[PDB]
């Protein structure tokens, strides 16, 4: 019973495993701007894909008109 008690205490610690377990530094301010960047950057990818179809449709429309 106590083996379980220490097992959960070991599992609940900052760096519990002798294996790979180092710390990581970061800055909250930089992350927030990055998270906002990916939102707009992704939206541009799909919008530019949509604009391709409009130009693609425009090209076929002219060819049909000049068929």
């Amino acid at each position: 019973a106590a083996a379980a008690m220490t097992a959960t205490r070991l599992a609940s610690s900052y760096m519990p495993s002798s294996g790979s377990s180092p710390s990581v530094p970061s800055s909250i301010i930089a992350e927030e701007k990055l998270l906002a960047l990916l939102a707009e950057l992704e939206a541009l990818s799909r919008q530019l894909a949509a604009l391709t179809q409009q130009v693609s449709e425009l090209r076929e429309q002219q060819q049909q008109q000049n068929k």
């Binding site: 760096m15 495993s17 002798s18 294996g19 790979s20 377990s21 180092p22």
Partner: protein
């Protein structure tokens, strides 16, 4: 018969003790930045572990 003084090696006794005391002590207790690792050994990634 020897024919010469007796063969003998030399050792600075006092200096060796002073160095050995200096190494078991503070020399081994420097911050890890002064420590390096050999080429053919692998250490666990965790920094707080005894190994």
């Amino acid at each position: 018969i020897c024919k010469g003084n007796v063969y003998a090696m030399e050792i600075n006794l006092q200096a060796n003790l002073w160095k050995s005391f200096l190494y078991s002590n503070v020399a081994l207790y420097l911050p890890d930045s002064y420590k390096y690792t050999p080429a053919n050994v692998k250490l666990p990634a965790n920094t707080n572990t005894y190994e």
